[PDB]
């Protein structure tokens, strides 16, 4: 191949190639990126059975058309040292040749062949994303799921698509808590009336750098592809049968309670100075925190005033994972939020106020938390 | 103990004290701060046989004298948790008792009587320091020094005082490098006209962050104790006998280069992108850069023209290590460097341009290195 790019584009093409390298081995192709031009475009791909990248940036000049791989982290720690002007690739022989003006560099390129084979599938299910609600889940939504679950379907997020009433449900869940949330008026194409796609919590992570809206989700229930212009991200899908939700969300509450966001986040911060959970008691016009988990004469309390009184006669306890509780706030875009109660010994929900209120940017989600005895 | 304190005053002292505590053991008396009002002042103090620092803020008010003490690392995650006005402390029996306004919390208190005393000199020598010269030339030689360096003496930084001349030189090494500043007109009081004090690295890193200007430096040939307003800080020396860094420095050099810092510092990091040694090969108006260490058939090579020529006949090589001539460089406040050399085989030196001419503010860093073969 012979052409040369811009220096800016292909650095930051390079950045996002990264996360897809087994960098730790140079002498193997898994720390390569594939690269490919053709007409004026350069393809830049990283690759393999669980997740991938392709991306493209245009040349500012094109000679010589062709394929060719060479180690991700060593091509981009190179780039990043160069001035801003455009930067000439040449292959040699299994050599790739890189010049700018004064400085050149020579990197060796692996048998092509060997690259993994970018898939491409026939999907089932496809949507068009044209605003953020879906990333915006995604993000509200990653904080209560472990990677490394030791269960393997609950290890990822759900993505259960409605065709029928057109709702794409977004799940995610550790089994002490449950975030969720319905998206609604999404304009599902599917074979199917009901489809569920099971995202692993590291291909999750990765579609937060790549994508924020106007992108394709597709999928064959084995693989899920999500395109825009510049890139074609793929995620293998965990296998199937993600608990469903619906199922243990309580029937109704008992209490609910409109308090302040910002002043709980505060006020369990405190608390979690000198404690892991927190007890919280609710009167008429008080919240009352105390730390629960912290070692003997180590104290922290708290109370914030509640103006528009609650709805109780006394006293209203609880127990709460004050981590949870705070994720569950710092999920939401409310200045006030619902706390919605029953028995203090069950599960217990956190959202936005007024979140039956339809949206269309931006997702509301909501979290159902297992409270601490006592 | 009954005061009232400002709780950025507060905040600030902890954070200072944090680096003096072993904060792994709660349950050990080295994981506190010790406290004692008087008059108006708070003090707080975190000590140990080799080093401490003793600081001390206002009382916005005063009720109550006395000592105590209270886990450093649990009192600073309270404040900095709290609002900006003003924090109640007080003792009840064992307990300190931490309040503003609905916020309240308990801390338990560890019998003073075990905590380490903090030391007291009779100072030896004693300057004043009342410029950034001192700390200019700690933090630019700090990384030469290992802090681990399993020679002893080695494992600080020299302060060699000169009644005589009013010189104090600063030399830092391991033993491939070594740099040294010579401090001029320094008003040094001393009881005999020659006096070496070597610091511990771990002392040098938190002077930096506690002193820059108008402070005392002193020392009993045992520990060193240095003062402003706010702080006493000290720290054990390291025994004696520092290798004479005047000895090893060659008496002449055959060649000696101006050259463009910024260039070089360009040069370099570009080439150690692939190598951590680097080939340079100077020429009257040019010089080159070629990665020395690399992998085979990965080469990484620049170039930066040289206007005003060198007295060179043909080309000089000089294999360098890239991480200390960069440190080298980073250590000099000029826009360009000198380099001196002799034969390729031997130590070269890298300082500022006019290095000879005096300046007050500022410390003038050299650098000697040995170079690498071929």
Same mark, same amino acid.
């Given at each position: ?8 584009? %292909?650095?930051?093409?390079? $950045?996002?190639?990264?996360? &897809? ?22 393809? %830049? ?6 997740? +991938? ?9 094109? @000679?010589?058309? +062709?394929?060719? #791989?060479?180690?991700?982290? *060593?091509?981009? @720690? ?13 292959? /040699? ?8 003006? /004064? ?6 390129? &692996? ?27 995604? /993000? ?11 269960? $393997?379907?609950?290890? +990822? ?15 995610? =869940? @550790?089994?002490?808590?449950? !975030? ?20 692993? /919590? $590291? ?31 793929? #995620? ?19 209490? !609910?309670?409109?308090?302040? *966001? ?9 608390? !979690? ?7 919280? =008691? ?19 309390? #708290? ?7 609650? @709805?109780?006669?006394?006293? &209203? ?5 004050? *981590? ?9 875009? =409310? =200045?006030?939020?619902? %706390? ?5 010994? !069950? ?19 909501? #979290? ?7």
């Amino acid at each position: 191949m012979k052409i040369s790019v811009s220096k800016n584009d %292909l650095e930051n093409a390079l $950045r996002y190639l990264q996360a &897809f390298l087994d960098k730790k081995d140079a002498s193997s192709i898994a720390s390569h990126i594939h690269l490919e031009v053709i007409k004026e475009k350069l393809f %830049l791909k990283a690759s393999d059975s669980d997740i +991938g990248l392709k991306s493209y940036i245009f040349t500012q000049s094109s @000679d010589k058309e +062709g394929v060719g #791989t060479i180690n991700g982290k *060593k091509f981009l @720690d190179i780039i990043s040292c160069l001035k801003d002007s455009n930067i000439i690739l040449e292959t /040699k022989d299994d050599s790739l040749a890189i010049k700018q003006n /004064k400085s050149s560099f020579k990197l060796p390129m &692996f048998d092509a062949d060997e690259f993994p084979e970018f898939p491409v599938i026939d999907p089932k299910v496809s949507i068009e994303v044209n605003a953020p609600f879906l990333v915006d889940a995604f /993000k509200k939504i990653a904080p209560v799921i472990e990677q490394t679950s030791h269960k $393997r379907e609950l290890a +990822g997020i759900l993505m259960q698509f409605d065709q029928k009433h057109q709702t794409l449900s977004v799940v995610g =869940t @550790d089994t002490k808590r449950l !975030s969720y949330t319905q998206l609604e008026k999404i304009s599902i194409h599917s074979t199917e009336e009901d489809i569920s796609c099971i995202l692993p /919590k $590291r291909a999750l992570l990765e579609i937060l750098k790549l994508f924020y809206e106007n992108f394709s989700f597709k999928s064959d229930g084995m693989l899920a592809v999500i395109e825009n212009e510049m890139h074609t991200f793929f #995620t293998k899908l965990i296998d199937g049968n993600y608990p469903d939700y619906q199922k243990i969300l309580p029937k109704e509450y008992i209490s !609910s309670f409109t308090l302040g *966001k910002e002043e709980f986040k505060e006020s369990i911060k405190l608390c !979690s100075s000198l404690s892991s959970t927190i007890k919280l =008691t609710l009167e008429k016009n008080n919240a009352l925190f105390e730390s629960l988990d912290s070692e003997h004469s180590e104290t922290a309390k #708290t109370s914030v005033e509640i103006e528009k009184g609650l @709805d109780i006669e006394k006293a &209203f306890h609880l127990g709460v994972n004050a *981590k949870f509780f705070l994720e569950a706030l710092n999920a939401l875009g =409310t =200045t006030q939020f619902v %706390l919605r109660c029953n028995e203090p010994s !069950s599960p217990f929900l956190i959202q936005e106020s007024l979140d039956e209120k339809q949206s269309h940017l931006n997702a509301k989600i909501s #979290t159902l938390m297992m409270p601490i005895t006592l």
